[PDB]
Amino acid sequence: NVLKGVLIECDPAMKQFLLYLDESNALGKKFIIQDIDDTHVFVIAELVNVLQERVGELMDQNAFSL
Amino acid sequence: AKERPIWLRESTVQG
Amino acid sequence: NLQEFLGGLSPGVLDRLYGHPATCLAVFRELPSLAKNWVMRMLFLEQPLPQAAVALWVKKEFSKAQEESTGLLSGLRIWHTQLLILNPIFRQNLRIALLGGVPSLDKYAEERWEVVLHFMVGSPSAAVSQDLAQLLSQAGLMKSTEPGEPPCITSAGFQFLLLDTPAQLWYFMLQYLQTAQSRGMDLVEILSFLFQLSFSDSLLNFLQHLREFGLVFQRKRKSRRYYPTRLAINQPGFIVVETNYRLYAYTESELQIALIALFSEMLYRFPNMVVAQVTRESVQQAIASGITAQQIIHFLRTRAHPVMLKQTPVLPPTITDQIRLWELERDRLRFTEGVLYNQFLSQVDFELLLAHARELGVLVFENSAKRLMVVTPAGHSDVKRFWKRQ
Amino acid sequence: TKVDEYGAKDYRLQMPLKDDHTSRPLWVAPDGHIFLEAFSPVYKYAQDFLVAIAEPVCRPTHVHEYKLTAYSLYAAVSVGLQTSDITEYLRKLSKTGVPDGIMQFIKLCTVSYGKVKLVLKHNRYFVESCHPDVIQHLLQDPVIRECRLRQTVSFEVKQEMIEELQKRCIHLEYPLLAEYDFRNDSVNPDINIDLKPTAVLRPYQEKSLRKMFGNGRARSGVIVLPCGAGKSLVGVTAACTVRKRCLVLGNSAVSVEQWKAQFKMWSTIDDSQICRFTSDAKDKPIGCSVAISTYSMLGHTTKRSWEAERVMEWLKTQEWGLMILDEVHTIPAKMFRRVLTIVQAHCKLGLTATLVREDDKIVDLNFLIGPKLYEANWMELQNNGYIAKVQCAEVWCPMSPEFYREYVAIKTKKRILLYTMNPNKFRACQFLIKFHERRNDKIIVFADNVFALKEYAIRLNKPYIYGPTSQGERMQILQNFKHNPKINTIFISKVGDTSFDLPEANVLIQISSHGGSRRQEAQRLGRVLRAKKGMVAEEYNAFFYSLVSQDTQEMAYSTKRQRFLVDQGYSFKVITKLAGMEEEDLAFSTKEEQQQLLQKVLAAT
DNA sequence: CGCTGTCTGCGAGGGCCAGCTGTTG
DNA sequence: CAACAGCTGGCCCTCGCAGACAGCG
Ligand SMILES: Nc1ncnc2c1ncn2[C@@H]1O[C@H](COP(=O)(O)OP(=O)(O)O)[C@@H](O)[C@H]1O
Ligand code: BEF
Ligand SMILES: [Mg+2]
Structure with missing residues (x-):
């Protein structure tokens, strides 16, 4: 099949967070259409911007404000 | 004479 | 660089530029070390010489210098193979050059350039000029979108701010020269003047622009004679960087404080000191605004207080390292648009399609184990057409 | 309080710039924050004065920062400084001058020392002062009158309410000077503790004790030194100077043993005098001139065992000239603070390295033991x-x-x-x-x-x-x-x-x-x-x-x-x-x- | 058959983080 | 209505104390 979207490349640990979001449907939909590799993932282009801030929140949680 | 390891001696950041 | 700019020019404009002798001297000066000798050799010669002879005049050692200089001059089109005689105009014009044919200024240049930077940032007290505003906006480092409202700073505008004054000015002139042709100003006239400065209606407008940036100063109600400043031909630091993400800026100028406030939080203000903290919220904002981490380290590096200079590295490594990590943290997810192909029933043909995708240069990532690959949508039609052809 | 465009506290309308600012390395904002320069030629002199009046907030290798707090100033007067001396030197060091608000603030928290004094004698706690007026003002306060036992004027106060008295005394701007006159106290026998010549105290160790013993009397406070600096030696030296019965409160069974070894290594006191009071064992605490224990043992709230209870009875019914409190920062805990009242001590010396806590109770050490005498x-x-x-x-x-x-x-x-x-x-x-x-x-x-x-x-x-x-x-x-x-x-x-x-x-x-x-x-x-x-x-x-x-x-x-x-x-x-x-x-x-x-x-x- | 050492629960406490109210613009 | 204090519950671990059980005489 032919699927058009956006490829996301990140560290392996970050990938599990993305899959967890897809399974938990925290975004309201299964943005992941097909996992590519432990290092790369394919997701729907429409929800990339909203997913972008979601990771930023994760970085925000694991970072201290001075 | 027991020099420091590489990671402590020089930056390990990719940049 | 200046030599870079000349190379990116047509032969027609170059020969026109090789006008009065001062230009030929100016272009001659930038010949690195070797070609300067070669220019003198084939200067009194009216008969072309073989290309082999030029090659064998440089010892095998340091041979790479022989080729690079030759390529540079071929780009400058100083000589032609003629089958290597110099340009008859350049030879003649150069021969004319070769026996043929203050403290107030620097302060003025620094201040007038500063007010332009003041205007760049949201400084209410800055020089206002409609021509200057559209110049920066059309220079690719600012955008208004509403003439009534003051313009903002583009992503490249913030980076331009951090660049050192020499490179900050040179980049501006380089953009100015390129847009001079588009607006209808002859590039040769302005470009020739810059060289002559290093030692008509078009110039009058150009001279006014140079006066505005503070490079030149008439001082006599815009007389024919002008007095170029130090910056026109072509400083101690004040920031103390601490291991706890604290910058103490020994600044009296509002511009530098505006610069440092770009990527740090201002805590206290003192006449010869300002306390700023490089919080990840600020730096992430600075990176988001468009700045690049290397510029932030460089901008703090160049304006380093003398006390930190003795220390090596002058910037404590953790601060430099930490800034980079703050930059790299934002781009953990590398978004890349593409089209995925799966259900590769034809396992043998999958490699053939893989090879075809590689040949076209469209493939970005591939997974042989899972028999899948991603191609950018630009090349999606090409691969789709290939699959349809079968 | 003016705020710049970049969320910066604008202090340009508040203070001027001194003409000879290059030599002067100090800044003084109306907020009290003091930014000293570590590369200035006169750093050494400024630091000692500054660390005393202001507790350091951050001290990078180049530019230090300090903050002025009422407790920070109250330590300055105790060591020997005076409002005229501090402000004059501060103005001399200031490269921008002292704002009127800070200048009056320094004065405000210096007219409170010496008004009231706390003296323990014959197992009785008395509120001593040479001015009857300040005592009368305290009596007007309700809780001060509540904790009362139920020329110079002194009224006895019950031991169990010493903490509340001390806390209110600060709140009334009348800190109690719990200063021990050991050299003029013959009631308590002098112990045979002596500093062996082999033990030489390092300059910071001696300087810390100098603040403690600036006058003939011994001062009670918290002395802060980096971990491994040798706080054991300073604590031992304090006992040697007092020459009275000394109580040392470690943090655990490991702490007391190291305290015991350090005393033997850095003092001539015989092994018989040194004793421990821990669950593991006890070296006859009933007979001992120097007692080493742990907050857990003394601060234990439940009924004590017979072996421990007998020692506890002796400890309560005793007079101690010096109570060294190792790991002071654990004192402001709910129960560990009670150990101060349970034991009777004239001068309380506190040793620690990290005078920080995730709660706001670290300030309680000001009155629970005393002002921060030193901080290397x-x-x-x-x-x-x-x-x-x-x-x-x-x-x-x-x-x-x-x-x-x-x-x-x-x-x-x-x-x-x-x-x-x-x-x-x-x-x-x-x-x-x-x-x-x-x-x-x-x-x-x-x-x-x-x-x-x-x-x-x-x-x-x-x-x-x-x-x-x-x-x-x-x-x-x-x-x-x-x-x-x-x-x-x-x-x-x-x-x-x-x-x-x-x-x-x-x-x-x-x-x-x-x-x-x-x-x-x-x-x-x-x-x-x-x-x-x-x-x-x-x-x-x-x-x-x-x-x-x-x-x-x-x-x-x-x-x-x-x-x-x-x-x-x-x-x-x-x-x-x-x-x-x-x-x-x-x-x-x-x-x-x-x-x-x-x-x-x-x-x- | 007694005495001392080991080990295992009771009860309490320190230090820190996170929470559902109480309070203020 | 939105936003920030604020002391306590909870959790982790730690400690002293008491009780029972095992080794020794
Ligand atoms: N003046 C000194 N001379 C020699 N050794 C010292 C001196 N002061 C301290 N030491 C050593 O430094 C260490 C201090 O340990 P300790 O007293 O527990 O430090 P702290 O209480 O500051 O954590 C010990 O090894 C001690 O012998
Ligand atoms: F380790 Be110490 F007692 F500061
Ligand atoms: Mg110690």
């Missing part, structure tokens, strides 16, 4: 060679994908075990121990989670210490670690983060921690901060590693707990990856091992 600068001592140079680091260990899958989803407080038991983190600890042992370095490993401590201890087959381990057994491990070459690495838990003297411990590693406890971090780094034999000032003799799990809550705590150390100039270099790990035969190299570990962690709950 860590970098100053580090360059002088008195404390080993440490290259702190933070090894970033990426979280295992199988673990992170569970960590992100799980939120019922089970995360701590999950990212404490990170296989990637384990490998870094395993590799680091192997490499450093090959370099003849004495490794120490800490872990708040005993589960993690046990998991790592057996897997690496290294000794581990924590709660259940008997005092003798844990004492044995330290002696083996101190001397036995075979025992090159030890594992410790929250028990041994404080008071553990391991001079040869060059390397330290931390795989877990209790939240953002700056006190825990600075204390934990202290173990390896002791001066080394063949130490060189600028050679980074010791090292500290705080293993953390990337993209995890431990990152937030790792930054939080580094706040104190960076305030003292320590830079925590980040180690994204460790070279040579791949070519090492480390544990958890297969997903099956990591898969097995994750299930066990989940089972623990």
Whole structure:
């Protein structure tokens, strides 16, 4: 099949967070259409911007404000 | 004479 | 660089530029070390010489210098193979050059350039000029979108701010020269003047622009004679960087404080000191605004207080390292648009399609184990057409 | 209070600029914050004056910062300074001048010292003062009258309400000067404690005592010195000066033993006089001139055993001229503060290294013991060679994908075990121990989670210490670690983060921690901060590693707990990856091992 | 059959983080 | 209505104390 979207490349640990979001449907939909590799993932282009801030929140949680 | 390891001696950041 | 700019020019404009002798001297000066000798050799010669002879005049050692200089001059089109005689105009014009044919200024240049930077940032007290505003906006480092409202700073505008004054000015002139042709100003006239400065209606407008940036100063109600400043031909630091993400800026100028406030939080203000903290919220904002981490380290590096200079590295490594990590943290997810192909029933043909995708240069990532690959949508039609052809 | 456009406190309309500002290295904002320059020619003189009046907030290697607080000033007058002397010198040092608000503020908190004094005599506490007017003003206060026992004028006050009296006295701007006149106190017999000539106190040690004994009388307060600076010697020297019965309150059974050894090493007091009062044993505390115990033993609230009760009865019915309180920062705890009232002491000397707490009760030490007499600068001592140079680091260990899958989803407080038991983190600890042992370095490993401590201890087959381990057994491990070459690495838990003297411990590693406890971090780094034999000032003799799990809550705590150390100039270099790990035969190299570990962690709950 | 050392529960406490009210613009 | 204090519950670990059980005479 032919699927058009956006490829996301990140560290392996970050990938599990993305899959967890897809399974938990925290975004309201299964943005992941097909996992590519432990290092790369394919997701729907429409929800990339909203997913972008979601990771930023994760970085925000694991970072201290001075 | 027991020099420091590489990671402590020089930056390990990719940049 | 200046030599870079000349190379990116047509032969027609170059020969026109090789006008009065001062230009030929100016272009001659930038010949690195070797070609300067070669220019003198084939200067009194009216008969072309073989290309082999030029090659064998440089010892095998340091041979790479022989080729690079030759390529540079071929780009400058100083000589032609003629089958290597110099340009008859350049030879003649150069021969004319070769026996043929203050403290107030620097302060003025620094201040007038500063007010332009003041205007760049949201400084209410800055020089206002409609021509200057559209110049920066059309220079690719600012955008208004509403003439009534003051313009903002583009992503490249913030980076331009951090660049050192020499490179900050040179980049501006380089953009100015390129847009001079588009607006209808002859590039040769302005470009020739810059060289002559290093030692008509078009110039009058150009001279006014140079006066505005503070490079030149008439001082006599815009007389024919002008007095170029130090910056026109072509400083101690004040920031103390601490291991706890604290910058103490020994600044009296509002511009530098505006610069440092770009990527740090201002805590206290003192006449010869300002306390700023490089919080990840600020730096992430600075990176988001468009700045690049290397510029932030460089901008703090160049304006380093003398006390930190003795220390090596002058910037404590953790601060430099930490800034980079703050930059790299934002781009953990590398978004890349593409089209995925799966259900590769034809396992043998999958490699053939893989090879075809590689040949076209469209493939970005591939997974042989899972028999899948991603191609950018630009090349999606090409691969789709290939699959349809079968 | 004017705020600039860049959220900056504009202080240009408040103060002017001095013409000769280049020589003057001091700034003084109306907020009280004082930014001193460390590269100025006159730094040495300014620092001693400034540290006394203002407690340092951050002291990087270039530009220090201090803050002015009523408690910070109250320490200045006690040592001997006066409002005229402080402000005049402050104005002399100021390169911008002292704003009117701060100038009056300094004056306000200097007309309160000496008005009221607290004197203990014959097992009775009295409120002494030479001015009847101030005493009368105190009597008007309700709680002050409530705690009353039920020319110079003194009214007796019940022991059980000393704390409330002291707290209100500060709130009434009349601090009680709990100053002990030991040299003019013949009622209490003089002990045979004497400083042997072999013991020479270092300049900071002597300077701290100079503030304590500025006058003939002995001052009671909190003396702060970096871990490993030698606070034991200063505490012993204080007893030698007092020459009275001394009570030393350690933190645990390990603390008292080291206190006992230090007294013998640094004093001529005979072994018979030295005694311990701990659950392990007691060296006849009934007969002893110097008593060593722990807050837990004295502060125990439940009914005491007969063996301990007999000693407790003697302790309450005694008069102590000097009560050394090791690890003062634990005093403001709800119950440990009671130990001050339970025991009767004239002068209370407090020794500690990390005068910080995650609550706001650290300020209570001002009246519970006294003003902060001294606070040495860590970098100053580090360059002088008195404390080993440490290259702190933070090894970033990426979280295992199988673990992170569970960590992100799980939120019922089970995360701590999950990212404490990170296989990637384990490998870094395993590799680091192997490499450093090959370099003849004495490794120490800490872990708040005993589960993690046990998991790592057996897997690496290294000794581990924590709660259940008997005092003798844990004492044995330290002696083996101190001397036995075979025992090159030890594992410790929250028990041994404080008071553990391991001079040869060059390397330290931390795989877990209790939240953002700056006190825990600075204390934990202290173990390896002791001066080394063949130490060189600028050679980074010791090292500290705080293993953390990337993209995890431990990152937030790792930054939080580094706040104190960076305030003292320590830079925590980040180690994204460790070279040579791949070519090492480390544990958890297969997903099956990591898969097995994750299930066990989940089972623990 | 007694005495001392080891080990295992009761009860309490320290330190820190997170929470549902109480309060203020 | 939105936003920030604020003391306590909870959790982790630690400690002293008491009780029972095992080794020794
Ligand atoms: N003046 C001194 N001369 C020699 N050794 C000293 C001196 N002061 C301290 N030491 C040593 O430094 C260490 C101090 O340990 P300790 O007193 O427990 O420190 P702290 O209480 O500051 O943590 C010990 O090894 C001690 O012998
Ligand atoms: F500061 Be120490 F370790 F008692
Ligand atoms: Mg100690």
